[PDB]
Coordinates of C-alpha atoms and ligand atoms in Angstrom, one line a residue:
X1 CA -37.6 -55.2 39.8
X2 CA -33.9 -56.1 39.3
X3 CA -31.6 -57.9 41.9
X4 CA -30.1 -56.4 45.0
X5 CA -29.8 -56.9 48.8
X6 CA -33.6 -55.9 50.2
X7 CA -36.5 -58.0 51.6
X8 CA -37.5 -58.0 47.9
X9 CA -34.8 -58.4 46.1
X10 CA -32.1 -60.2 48.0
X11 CA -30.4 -63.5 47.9
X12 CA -33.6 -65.6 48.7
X13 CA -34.8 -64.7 45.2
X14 CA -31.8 -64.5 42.9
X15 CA -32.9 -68.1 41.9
X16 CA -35.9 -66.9 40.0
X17 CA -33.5 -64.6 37.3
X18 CA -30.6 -67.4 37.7
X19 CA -31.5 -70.6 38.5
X20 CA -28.0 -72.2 38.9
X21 CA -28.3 -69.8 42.5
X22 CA -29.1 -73.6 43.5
X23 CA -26.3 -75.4 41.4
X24 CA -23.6 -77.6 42.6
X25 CA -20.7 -75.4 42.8
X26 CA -22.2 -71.9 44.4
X27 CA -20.1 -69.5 46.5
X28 CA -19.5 -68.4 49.3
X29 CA -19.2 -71.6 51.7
X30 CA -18.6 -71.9 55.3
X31 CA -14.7 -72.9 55.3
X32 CA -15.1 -75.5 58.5
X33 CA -11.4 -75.6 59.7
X34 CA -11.7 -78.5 60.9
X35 CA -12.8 -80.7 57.8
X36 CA -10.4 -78.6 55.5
X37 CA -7.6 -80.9 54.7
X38 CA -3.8 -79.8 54.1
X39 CA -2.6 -80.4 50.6
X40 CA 1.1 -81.0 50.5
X41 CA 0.7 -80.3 46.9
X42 CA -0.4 -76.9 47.0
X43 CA 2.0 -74.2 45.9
X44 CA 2.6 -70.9 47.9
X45 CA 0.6 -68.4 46.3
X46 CA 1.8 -66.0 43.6
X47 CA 0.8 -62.6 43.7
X48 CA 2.1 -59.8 41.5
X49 CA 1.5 -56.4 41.9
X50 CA 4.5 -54.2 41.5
X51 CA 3.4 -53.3 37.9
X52 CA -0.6 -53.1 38.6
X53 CA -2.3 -49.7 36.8
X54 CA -5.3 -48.7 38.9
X55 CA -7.4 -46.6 36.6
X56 CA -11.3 -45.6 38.1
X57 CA -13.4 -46.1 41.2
X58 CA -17.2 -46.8 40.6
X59 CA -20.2 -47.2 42.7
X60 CA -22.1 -49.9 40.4
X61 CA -25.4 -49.6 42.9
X62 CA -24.5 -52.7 45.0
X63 CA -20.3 -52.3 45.8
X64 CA -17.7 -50.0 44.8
X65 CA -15.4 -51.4 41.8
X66 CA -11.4 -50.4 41.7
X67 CA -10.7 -51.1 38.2
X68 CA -7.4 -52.0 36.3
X69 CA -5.8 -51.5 33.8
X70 CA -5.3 -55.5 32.1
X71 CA -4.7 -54.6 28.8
X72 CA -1.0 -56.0 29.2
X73 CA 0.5 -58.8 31.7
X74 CA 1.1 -56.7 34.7
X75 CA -0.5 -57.3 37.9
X76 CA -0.8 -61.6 37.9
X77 CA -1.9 -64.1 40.3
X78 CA -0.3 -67.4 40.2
X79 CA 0.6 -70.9 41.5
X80 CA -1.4 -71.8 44.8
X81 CA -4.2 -74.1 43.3
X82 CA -3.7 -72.5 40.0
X83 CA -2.9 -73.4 36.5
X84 CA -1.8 -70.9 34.1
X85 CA -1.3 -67.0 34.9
X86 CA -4.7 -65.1 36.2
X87 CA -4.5 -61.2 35.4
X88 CA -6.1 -58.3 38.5
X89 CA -9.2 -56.5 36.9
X90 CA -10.6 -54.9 39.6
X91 CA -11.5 -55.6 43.2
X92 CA -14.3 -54.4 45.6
X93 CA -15.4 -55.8 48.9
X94 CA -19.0 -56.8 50.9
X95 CA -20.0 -55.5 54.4
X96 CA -22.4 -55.3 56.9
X97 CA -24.4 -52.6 58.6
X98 CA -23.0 -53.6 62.2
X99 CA -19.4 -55.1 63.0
X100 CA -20.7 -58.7 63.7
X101 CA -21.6 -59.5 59.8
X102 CA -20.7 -58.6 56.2
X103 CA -18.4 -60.9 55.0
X104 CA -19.7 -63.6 52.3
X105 CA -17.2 -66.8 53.4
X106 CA -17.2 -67.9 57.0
X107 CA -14.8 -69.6 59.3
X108 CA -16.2 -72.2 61.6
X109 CA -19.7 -70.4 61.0
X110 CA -17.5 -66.9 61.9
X111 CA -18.6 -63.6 60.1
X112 CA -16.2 -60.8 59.9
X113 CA -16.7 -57.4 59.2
X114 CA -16.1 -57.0 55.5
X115 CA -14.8 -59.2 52.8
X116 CA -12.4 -57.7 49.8
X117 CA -12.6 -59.5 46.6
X118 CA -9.3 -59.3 44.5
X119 CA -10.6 -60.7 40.5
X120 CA -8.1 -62.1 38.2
X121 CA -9.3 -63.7 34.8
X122 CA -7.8 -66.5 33.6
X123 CA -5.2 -65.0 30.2
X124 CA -6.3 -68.3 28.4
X125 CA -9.1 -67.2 27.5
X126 CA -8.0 -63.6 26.1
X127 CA -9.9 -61.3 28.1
X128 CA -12.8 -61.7 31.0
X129 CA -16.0 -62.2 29.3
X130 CA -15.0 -65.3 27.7
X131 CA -13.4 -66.5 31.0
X132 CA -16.5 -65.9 32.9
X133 CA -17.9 -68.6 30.3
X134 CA -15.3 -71.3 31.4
X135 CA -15.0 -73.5 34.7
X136 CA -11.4 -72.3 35.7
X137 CA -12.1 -68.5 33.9
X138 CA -11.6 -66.8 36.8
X139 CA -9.7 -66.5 40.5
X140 CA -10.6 -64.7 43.5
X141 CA -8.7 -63.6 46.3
X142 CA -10.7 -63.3 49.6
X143 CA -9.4 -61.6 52.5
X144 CA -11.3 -60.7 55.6
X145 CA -11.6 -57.7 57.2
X146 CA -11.8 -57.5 61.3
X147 CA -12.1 -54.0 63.0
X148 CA -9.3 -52.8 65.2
X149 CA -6.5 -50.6 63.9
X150 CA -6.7 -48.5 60.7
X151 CA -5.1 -50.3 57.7
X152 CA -3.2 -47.4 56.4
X153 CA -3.2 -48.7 52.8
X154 CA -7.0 -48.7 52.6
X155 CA -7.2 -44.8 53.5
X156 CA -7.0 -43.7 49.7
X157 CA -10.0 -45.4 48.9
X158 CA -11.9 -44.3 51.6
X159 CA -11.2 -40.8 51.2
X160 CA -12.6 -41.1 47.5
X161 CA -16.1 -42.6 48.4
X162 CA -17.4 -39.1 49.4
X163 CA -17.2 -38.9 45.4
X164 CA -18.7 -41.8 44.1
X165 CA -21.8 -41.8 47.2
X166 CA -24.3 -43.3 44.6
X167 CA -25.3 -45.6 42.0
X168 CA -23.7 -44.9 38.7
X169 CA -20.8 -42.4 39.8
X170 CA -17.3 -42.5 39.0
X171 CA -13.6 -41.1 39.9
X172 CA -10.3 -41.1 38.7
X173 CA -8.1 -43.8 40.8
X174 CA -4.8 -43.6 39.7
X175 CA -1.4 -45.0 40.7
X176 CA -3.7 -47.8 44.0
X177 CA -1.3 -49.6 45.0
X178 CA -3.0 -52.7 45.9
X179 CA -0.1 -54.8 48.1
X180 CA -1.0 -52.1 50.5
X181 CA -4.5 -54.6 51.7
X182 CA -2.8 -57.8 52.3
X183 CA -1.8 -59.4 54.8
X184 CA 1.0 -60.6 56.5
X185 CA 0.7 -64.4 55.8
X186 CA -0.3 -65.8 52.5
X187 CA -1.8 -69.4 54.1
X188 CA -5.1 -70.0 52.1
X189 CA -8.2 -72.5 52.0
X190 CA -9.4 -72.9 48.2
X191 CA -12.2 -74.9 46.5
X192 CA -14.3 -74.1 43.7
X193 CA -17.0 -72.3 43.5
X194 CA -19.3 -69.0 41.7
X195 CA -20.0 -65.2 41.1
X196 CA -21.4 -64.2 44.6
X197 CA -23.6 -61.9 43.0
X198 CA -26.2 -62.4 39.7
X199 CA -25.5 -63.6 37.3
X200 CA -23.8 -66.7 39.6
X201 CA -21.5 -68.0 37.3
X202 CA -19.3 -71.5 38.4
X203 CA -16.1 -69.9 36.8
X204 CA -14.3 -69.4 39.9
X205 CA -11.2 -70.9 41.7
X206 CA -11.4 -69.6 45.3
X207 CA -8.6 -68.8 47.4
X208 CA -9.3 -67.4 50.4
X209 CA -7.0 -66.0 52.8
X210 CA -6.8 -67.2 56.6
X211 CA -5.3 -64.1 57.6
X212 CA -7.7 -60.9 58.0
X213 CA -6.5 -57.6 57.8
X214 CA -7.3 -55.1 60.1
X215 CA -9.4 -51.9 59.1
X216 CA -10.4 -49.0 61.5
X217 CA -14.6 -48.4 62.7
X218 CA -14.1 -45.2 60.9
X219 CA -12.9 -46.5 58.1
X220 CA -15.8 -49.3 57.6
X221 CA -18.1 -46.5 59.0
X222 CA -17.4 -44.8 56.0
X223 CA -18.1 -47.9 53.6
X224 CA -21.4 -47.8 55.2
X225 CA -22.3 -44.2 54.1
X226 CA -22.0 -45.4 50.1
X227 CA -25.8 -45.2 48.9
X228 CA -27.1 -48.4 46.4
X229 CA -29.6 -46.0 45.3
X230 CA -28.3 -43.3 42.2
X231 CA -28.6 -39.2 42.8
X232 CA -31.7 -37.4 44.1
X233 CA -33.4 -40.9 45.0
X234 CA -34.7 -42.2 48.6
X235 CA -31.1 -42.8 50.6
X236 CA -30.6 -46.5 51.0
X237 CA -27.4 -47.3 52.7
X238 CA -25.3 -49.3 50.9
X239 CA -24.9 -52.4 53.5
X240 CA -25.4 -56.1 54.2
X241 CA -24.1 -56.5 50.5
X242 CA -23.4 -60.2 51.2
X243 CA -25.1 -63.1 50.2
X244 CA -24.9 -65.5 52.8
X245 CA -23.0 -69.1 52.9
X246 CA -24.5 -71.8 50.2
X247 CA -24.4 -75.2 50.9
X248 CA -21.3 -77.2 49.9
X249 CA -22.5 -80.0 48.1
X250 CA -19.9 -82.0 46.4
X251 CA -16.9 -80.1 47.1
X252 CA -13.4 -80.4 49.3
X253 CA -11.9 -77.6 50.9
X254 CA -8.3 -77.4 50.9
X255 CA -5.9 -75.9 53.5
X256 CA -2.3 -74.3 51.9
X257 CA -1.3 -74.9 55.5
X258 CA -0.5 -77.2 58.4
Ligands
MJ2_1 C1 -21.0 -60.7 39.3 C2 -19.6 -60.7 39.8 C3 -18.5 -60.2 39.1 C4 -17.3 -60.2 39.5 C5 -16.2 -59.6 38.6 C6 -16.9 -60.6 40.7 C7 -17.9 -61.2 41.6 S1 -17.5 -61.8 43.1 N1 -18.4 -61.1 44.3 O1 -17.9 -63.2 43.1 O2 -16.1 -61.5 43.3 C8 -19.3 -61.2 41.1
ZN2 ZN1 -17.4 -60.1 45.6

Protein backbone atom coordinates (compact mmCIF):
# COMPACT_ATOMS: atom_id res chain seq x y z
CA UNK A 1 0.00 0.00 0.00
CA UNK A 2 2.51 2.66 -1.18
CA UNK A 3 1.63 6.28 -2.31
CA UNK A 4 0.11 7.29 -5.61
CA UNK A 5 -2.86 9.36 -7.08
CA UNK A 6 -6.12 6.94 -6.19
CA UNK A 7 -9.05 7.26 -3.69
CA UNK A 8 -6.66 5.27 -1.55
CA UNK A 9 -3.61 6.35 -2.02
CA UNK A 10 -3.63 10.00 -3.10
CA UNK A 11 -2.64 13.30 -1.63
CA UNK A 12 -5.27 13.21 1.34
CA UNK A 13 -3.08 10.41 2.84
CA UNK A 14 0.48 11.19 1.98
CA UNK A 15 0.56 12.70 5.63
CA UNK A 16 0.40 9.36 7.20
CA UNK A 17 4.01 8.05 5.43
CA UNK A 18 5.32 11.90 5.59
CA UNK A 19 4.04 13.95 8.07
CA UNK A 20 5.66 17.34 7.07
CA UNK A 21 2.74 16.84 3.99
CA UNK A 22 1.31 19.43 6.69
CA UNK A 23 4.59 21.54 7.32
CA UNK A 24 5.13 25.18 6.80
CA UNK A 25 6.68 25.39 3.55
CA UNK A 26 4.64 22.65 1.24
CA UNK A 27 4.25 23.04 -2.57
CA UNK A 28 2.37 23.68 -4.86
CA UNK A 29 0.45 27.05 -3.82
CA UNK A 30 -2.12 29.10 -5.51
CA UNK A 31 0.06 32.05 -6.99
CA UNK A 32 -2.82 34.93 -6.26
CA UNK A 33 -1.60 37.67 -8.86
CA UNK A 34 -2.89 40.03 -7.09
CA UNK A 35 -1.10 39.72 -3.62
CA UNK A 36 2.26 38.66 -5.44
CA UNK A 37 4.46 41.62 -5.02
CA UNK A 38 7.19 42.92 -7.68
CA UNK A 39 10.75 42.66 -6.38
CA UNK A 40 12.97 45.22 -8.06
CA UNK A 41 15.69 43.10 -6.71
CA UNK A 42 15.04 40.12 -8.57
CA UNK A 43 17.44 39.10 -11.32
CA UNK A 44 16.29 37.95 -14.90
CA UNK A 45 16.53 34.39 -14.86
CA UNK A 46 19.41 32.33 -16.05
CA UNK A 47 18.88 29.37 -18.00
CA UNK A 48 21.51 27.32 -19.71
CA UNK A 49 20.96 24.70 -21.96
CA UNK A 50 23.11 24.72 -25.02
CA UNK A 51 25.47 22.01 -23.48
CA UNK A 52 22.54 19.82 -21.72
CA UNK A 53 23.13 15.77 -22.40
CA UNK A 54 19.74 14.07 -22.32
CA UNK A 55 20.41 10.47 -21.56
CA UNK A 56 16.96 8.05 -20.76
CA UNK A 57 13.24 8.36 -20.62
CA UNK A 58 11.48 6.41 -17.70
CA UNK A 59 8.04 5.75 -16.58
CA UNK A 60 8.72 5.59 -12.66
CA UNK A 61 4.76 4.44 -12.12
CA UNK A 62 3.51 8.02 -11.32
CA UNK A 63 5.25 10.49 -14.30
CA UNK A 64 7.65 10.04 -16.95
CA UNK A 65 11.39 11.21 -15.97
CA UNK A 66 13.84 12.78 -18.86
CA UNK A 67 17.04 12.32 -17.26
CA UNK A 68 20.53 14.14 -17.60
CA UNK A 69 23.50 13.84 -17.83
CA UNK A 70 24.99 16.25 -14.53
CA UNK A 71 28.08 14.66 -14.13
CA UNK A 72 29.86 17.99 -15.36
CA UNK A 73 28.64 21.80 -15.24
CA UNK A 74 26.56 21.86 -18.43
CA UNK A 75 23.01 22.63 -18.46
CA UNK A 76 22.69 25.47 -15.26
CA UNK A 77 20.04 27.46 -13.91
CA UNK A 78 20.96 30.74 -12.36
CA UNK A 79 20.30 34.26 -11.06
CA UNK A 80 16.43 35.07 -10.67
CA UNK A 81 15.95 34.43 -6.84
CA UNK A 82 18.91 32.26 -6.84
CA UNK A 83 22.23 31.99 -5.12
CA UNK A 84 24.95 29.97 -6.44
CA UNK A 85 24.66 27.80 -9.82
CA UNK A 86 21.68 25.00 -9.84
CA UNK A 87 22.63 21.98 -12.37
CA UNK A 88 19.23 20.21 -14.91
CA UNK A 89 18.80 16.50 -13.72
CA UNK A 90 15.84 15.61 -15.20
CA UNK A 91 12.42 16.96 -15.76
CA UNK A 92 8.85 15.48 -16.12
CA UNK A 93 5.44 17.09 -15.87
CA UNK A 94 1.77 16.50 -14.05
CA UNK A 95 -1.65 16.31 -15.87
CA UNK A 96 -5.05 15.74 -15.85
CA UNK A 97 -7.48 13.32 -17.36
CA UNK A 98 -9.61 16.25 -18.99
CA UNK A 99 -8.23 19.73 -20.27
CA UNK A 100 -9.71 21.79 -17.23
CA UNK A 101 -7.07 20.30 -14.56
CA UNK A 102 -3.61 18.86 -14.12
CA UNK A 103 -1.40 21.31 -13.23
CA UNK A 104 -0.01 21.39 -9.48
CA UNK A 105 0.38 25.55 -9.10
CA UNK A 106 -2.58 27.76 -9.87
CA UNK A 107 -3.10 31.21 -10.97
CA UNK A 108 -5.87 33.16 -9.34
CA UNK A 109 -7.36 29.58 -8.41
CA UNK A 110 -6.64 28.80 -12.47
CA UNK A 111 -5.70 25.09 -13.48
CA UNK A 112 -4.04 24.46 -16.64
CA UNK A 113 -3.70 21.55 -18.53
CA UNK A 114 -0.35 20.11 -17.53
CA UNK A 115 2.52 21.37 -15.54
CA UNK A 116 6.47 20.56 -16.68
CA UNK A 117 8.85 20.42 -13.92
CA UNK A 118 12.49 21.42 -14.98
CA UNK A 119 14.92 20.08 -11.51
CA UNK A 120 18.17 21.63 -10.93
CA UNK A 121 20.22 20.69 -7.65
CA UNK A 122 22.02 23.08 -6.00
CA UNK A 123 26.36 22.22 -7.11
CA UNK A 124 26.96 23.24 -3.32
CA UNK A 125 26.13 20.45 -2.13
CA UNK A 126 28.10 18.02 -4.68
CA UNK A 127 25.38 15.99 -6.14
CA UNK A 128 21.36 15.78 -5.50
CA UNK A 129 20.81 13.53 -2.56
CA UNK A 130 22.65 15.73 -0.26
CA UNK A 131 20.81 18.77 -1.78
CA UNK A 132 17.45 17.31 -1.22
CA UNK A 133 18.73 17.39 2.55
CA UNK A 134 19.19 21.22 2.54
CA UNK A 135 16.63 24.20 2.48
CA UNK A 136 18.01 25.86 -0.82
CA UNK A 137 19.22 22.13 -2.28
CA UNK A 138 17.13 22.33 -5.02
CA UNK A 139 15.27 24.72 -7.88
CA UNK A 140 12.39 24.08 -10.01
CA UNK A 141 11.30 25.50 -13.06
CA UNK A 142 7.39 25.46 -13.58
CA UNK A 143 5.92 26.12 -16.76
CA UNK A 144 2.27 25.60 -17.59
CA UNK A 145 0.89 23.92 -20.34
CA UNK A 146 -2.56 25.25 -22.07
CA UNK A 147 -3.96 23.27 -25.17
CA UNK A 148 -4.09 25.00 -28.49
CA UNK A 149 -1.32 24.53 -31.07
CA UNK A 150 1.24 21.69 -31.10
CA UNK A 151 4.56 22.75 -29.37
CA UNK A 152 6.75 21.34 -31.93
CA UNK A 153 9.65 20.75 -29.47
CA UNK A 154 7.57 18.47 -27.19
CA UNK A 155 6.93 15.97 -30.23
CA UNK A 156 10.14 13.78 -29.51
CA UNK A 157 8.95 12.92 -26.29
CA UNK A 158 5.72 12.09 -27.22
CA UNK A 159 6.59 9.87 -29.83
CA UNK A 160 8.78 7.83 -27.28
CA UNK A 161 5.92 7.17 -24.63
CA UNK A 162 4.51 4.27 -26.79
CA UNK A 163 7.83 2.66 -25.37
CA UNK A 164 7.97 3.34 -21.91
CA UNK A 165 3.64 2.75 -21.44
CA UNK A 166 4.22 1.31 -17.94
CA UNK A 167 5.68 1.30 -14.64
CA UNK A 168 9.29 0.50 -14.58
CA UNK A 169 10.18 0.92 -18.45
CA UNK A 170 12.86 2.76 -20.01
CA UNK A 171 14.34 4.26 -23.44
CA UNK A 172 17.26 5.74 -24.76
CA UNK A 173 16.72 9.77 -25.02
CA UNK A 174 19.52 11.06 -26.54
CA UNK A 175 20.65 14.47 -27.86
CA UNK A 176 16.51 16.45 -26.01
CA UNK A 177 17.08 19.44 -26.49
CA UNK A 178 15.24 20.99 -23.78
CA UNK A 179 15.09 25.04 -24.85
CA UNK A 180 12.67 23.58 -27.28
CA UNK A 181 9.65 23.74 -24.11
CA UNK A 182 9.99 27.19 -23.04
CA UNK A 183 8.51 29.92 -23.52
CA UNK A 184 8.72 33.11 -24.92
CA UNK A 185 8.94 35.38 -21.80
CA UNK A 186 10.98 34.43 -18.86
CA UNK A 187 8.70 36.71 -16.20
CA UNK A 188 8.40 34.44 -13.06
CA UNK A 189 6.57 34.34 -9.43
CA UNK A 190 8.97 32.47 -6.89
CA UNK A 191 8.65 31.49 -3.17
CA UNK A 192 9.73 28.60 -1.28
CA UNK A 193 8.41 25.63 -1.00
CA UNK A 194 8.64 21.24 -1.33
CA UNK A 195 8.82 17.99 -3.31
CA UNK A 196 5.16 17.82 -4.77
CA UNK A 197 5.31 14.19 -4.45
CA UNK A 198 6.40 11.79 -1.23
CA UNK A 199 8.77 12.08 0.22
CA UNK A 200 7.78 16.18 0.43
CA UNK A 201 10.94 17.53 1.20
CA UNK A 202 11.22 21.71 1.90
CA UNK A 203 14.41 21.87 -0.32
CA UNK A 204 13.00 23.81 -3.04
CA UNK A 205 13.27 27.33 -4.50
CA UNK A 206 10.24 27.79 -6.87
CA UNK A 207 10.27 29.69 -9.86
CA UNK A 208 7.47 29.48 -11.79
CA UNK A 209 6.84 30.78 -15.12
CA UNK A 210 3.85 33.17 -15.97
CA UNK A 211 4.04 32.30 -19.40
CA UNK A 212 2.38 28.83 -20.52
CA UNK A 213 3.35 27.07 -23.50
CA UNK A 214 1.15 25.72 -25.75
CA UNK A 215 0.82 21.86 -26.45
CA UNK A 216 -1.62 20.14 -28.91
CA UNK A 217 -5.00 17.69 -27.53
CA UNK A 218 -3.16 15.09 -29.39
CA UNK A 219 -0.22 15.61 -27.81
CA UNK A 220 -1.61 15.72 -24.03
CA UNK A 221 -3.98 12.86 -25.35
CA UNK A 222 -1.04 10.91 -25.64
CA UNK A 223 0.35 11.74 -21.98
CA UNK A 224 -2.85 10.32 -20.90
CA UNK A 225 -2.41 6.86 -22.48
CA UNK A 226 0.98 6.29 -20.13
CA UNK A 227 -0.23 3.49 -17.64
CA UNK A 228 0.96 3.98 -13.45
CA UNK A 229 0.47 0.40 -13.35
CA UNK A 230 3.80 -2.02 -14.64
CA UNK A 231 3.29 -4.80 -17.65
CA UNK A 232 0.53 -7.39 -17.67
CA UNK A 233 -1.30 -5.53 -14.70
CA UNK A 234 -5.10 -4.05 -14.62
CA UNK A 235 -4.56 -0.73 -17.07
CA UNK A 236 -4.75 2.41 -14.88
CA UNK A 237 -4.35 5.50 -16.83
CA UNK A 238 -1.70 7.48 -15.84
CA UNK A 239 -3.65 10.95 -14.98
CA UNK A 240 -4.64 13.53 -12.40
CA UNK A 241 -0.93 13.05 -11.25
CA UNK A 242 -1.13 16.39 -9.32
CA UNK A 243 -1.44 17.05 -5.91
CA UNK A 244 -3.54 19.91 -5.45
CA UNK A 245 -2.61 23.55 -3.98
CA UNK A 246 -1.39 23.56 -0.05
CA UNK A 247 -2.02 26.22 2.01
CA UNK A 248 0.48 29.13 2.08
CA UNK A 249 1.17 29.69 5.53
CA UNK A 250 4.00 31.93 6.25
CA UNK A 251 5.21 32.65 2.92
CA UNK A 252 5.45 35.79 0.17
CA UNK A 253 5.16 35.32 -3.25
CA UNK A 254 7.25 37.37 -5.50
CA UNK A 255 6.55 38.68 -9.03
CA UNK A 256 10.05 39.09 -11.48
CA UNK A 257 7.67 41.50 -13.16
CA UNK A 258 5.73 44.65 -13.18
C1 LIG B 1 9.87 13.48 -5.17
C2 LIG B 1 10.26 14.51 -6.19
C3 LIG B 1 11.49 14.47 -6.79
C4 LIG B 1 11.91 15.36 -7.72
C5 LIG B 1 13.29 15.27 -8.34
C6 LIG B 1 11.05 16.38 -8.11
C7 LIG B 1 9.79 16.50 -7.54
S1 LIG B 1 8.72 17.84 -7.97
N1 LIG B 1 7.32 17.22 -8.49
O1 LIG B 1 8.51 18.57 -6.74
O2 LIG B 1 9.39 18.53 -9.05
C8 LIG B 1 9.39 15.54 -6.58
ZN1 LIG C 1 6.85 17.68 -10.34
Amino acid sequence: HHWGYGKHNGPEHWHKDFPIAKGERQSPVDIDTHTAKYDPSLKPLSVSYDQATSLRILNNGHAFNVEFDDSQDKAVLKGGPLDGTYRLIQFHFHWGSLDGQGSEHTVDKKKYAAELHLVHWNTKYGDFGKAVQQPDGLAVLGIFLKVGSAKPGLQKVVDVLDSIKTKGKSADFTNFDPRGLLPESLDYWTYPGSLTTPPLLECVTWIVLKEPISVSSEQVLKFRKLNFNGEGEPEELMVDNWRPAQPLKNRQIKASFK
